[PDB]
Design a protein around this nucleic acid. Structure first.
Ligand SMILES: [Mg+2]
Ligand SMILES: [Mg+2]
Ligand code: NA
Ligand code: NA
Length: 326
DNA sequence: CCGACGGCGCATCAGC
DNA sequence: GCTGATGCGCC
DNA sequence: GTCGG
């Protein structure tokens, strides 16, 4: 974090554009600039030096110059004083409240943690649970705790059926010392791109993890994705562990590499990699990499035998999970 | 200049 | 109920 | 907001 002030500034601006302006590309441009500045291995001395980086343009260079000379950004100071922007930015922090629901709550004077707490009946289920664990969800997970959570999830999955493979992805798989939540890829031989020879493959794993009190709440649940809450068990007289967001994603077994690429991330790495795919005339999702056709239509799935194959197609040297933290 | 920016799962809603 | 759009989330 | 065409 040589340019910590700068990238904090940009992230804050990205958050404004997402939550308040609802200008998603502006959010993206900012997060992108932030990301390329974050791995730039020199302490930046000027806007004009940052502008050299791909993703830093004119406006962001000016902001960088204003930030370096004065330690501040006047544009952010204003945004920070605005009641309506601070309100919206705060509400969107609850999982399940985004830009639209946030603005809509303000329209009604529901705008503080205390307002939300007297008004649970105006929240859908996801939002009610996000408010419930509001504080907990702010806390990072140390790797040590990620490691116990893993043994639990790997062992319980093996118990339902010895042929499920669960793989912890996300920043954990990227070797991060702490993680915002747990991301779990799940496969079973019965579920492939050809057929689903067994129903409830995801359900059964969820039920199991509820039966051991590991999974405590559900934000959303379908046939391939679970989005919910979990908690490590604590010992006699210990304060409890914080509750933690868990995400479980069931992926056809023969598409494990595109799935594990996807779920390892980071989000920005994915966006850039996928963006580059397109320039190379391919498209990648969590399932397959397909060529782009002359017209603009996705051709057939290309054969993939490792994460590296995916990189090969798009003419990128391999990058280990730990080098994907953009 | 100016079009395009990654891709998709689930909850929810409107319109039929 | 179905189908498709919009909201929100995941990386 | 930035970039390639
Ligand atoms: Mg995570
Ligand atoms: Mg997660
Ligand atoms: Na640039
Ligand atoms: Na939110």
């Amino acid at each position: 974090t040589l340019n910590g002030g700068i990238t904090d500034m940009l992230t804050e601006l990205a958050n404004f554009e997402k939550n308040v302006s609802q200008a998603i590309h502006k959010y993206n441009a900012y997060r992108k600039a932030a990301s390329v500045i974050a791995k730039y291995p020199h302490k930046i001395k000027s806007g004009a030096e940052a502008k050299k980086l791909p993703g830093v343009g004119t406006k962001i260079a000016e902001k960088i110059d204003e930030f370096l000379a004065t330690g501040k950004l006047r544009k952010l100071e204003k945004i920070r004083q605005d009641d309506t922007s601070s309100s919206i930015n705060f509400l969107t922090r609850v999982s399940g409240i985004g830009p639209s629901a946030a603005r809509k709550f303000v329209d009604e004077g529901i705008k503080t943690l205390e307002d939300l707490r007297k008004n649970e009946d105006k929240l859908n289920h996801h939002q009610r649970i996000g408010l419930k664990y509001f504080g907990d969800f702010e806390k990072r997970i140390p790797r040590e705790e990620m490691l116990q959570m893993q043994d639990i999830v790997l062992n319980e999955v093996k118990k339902v059926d010895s042929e499920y493979i669960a793989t912890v992805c996300g920043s954990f798989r990227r070797g991060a010392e702490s993680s915002g939540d747990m991301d779990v890829l799940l496969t079973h031989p019965s579920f492939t791109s050809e057929s689903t020879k067994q129903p409830k493959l995801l359900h059964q794993v969820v039920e199991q993890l509820q039966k051991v009190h590991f999974i405590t709440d559900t934000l959303s649940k379908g046939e391939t994705k679970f989005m919910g809450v979990c908690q490590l068990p604590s010992k006699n007289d210990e304060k409890e562990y914080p509750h933690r967001r868990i995400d479980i994603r069931l992926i056809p077994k023969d598409q494990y590499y595109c799935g594990v690429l996807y779920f390892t991330g980071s989000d920005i790495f994915n966006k850039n990699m996928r963006a580059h795919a397109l320039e190379k005339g391919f498209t990648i999702n969590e399932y397959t990499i397909r060529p782009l056709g002359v017209t603009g239509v996705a051709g057939e799935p290309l054969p993939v035998d490792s994460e590296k194959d995916i990189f090969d197609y798009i003419q990128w040297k391999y990058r280990e999970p730990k080098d994907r933290s953009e």
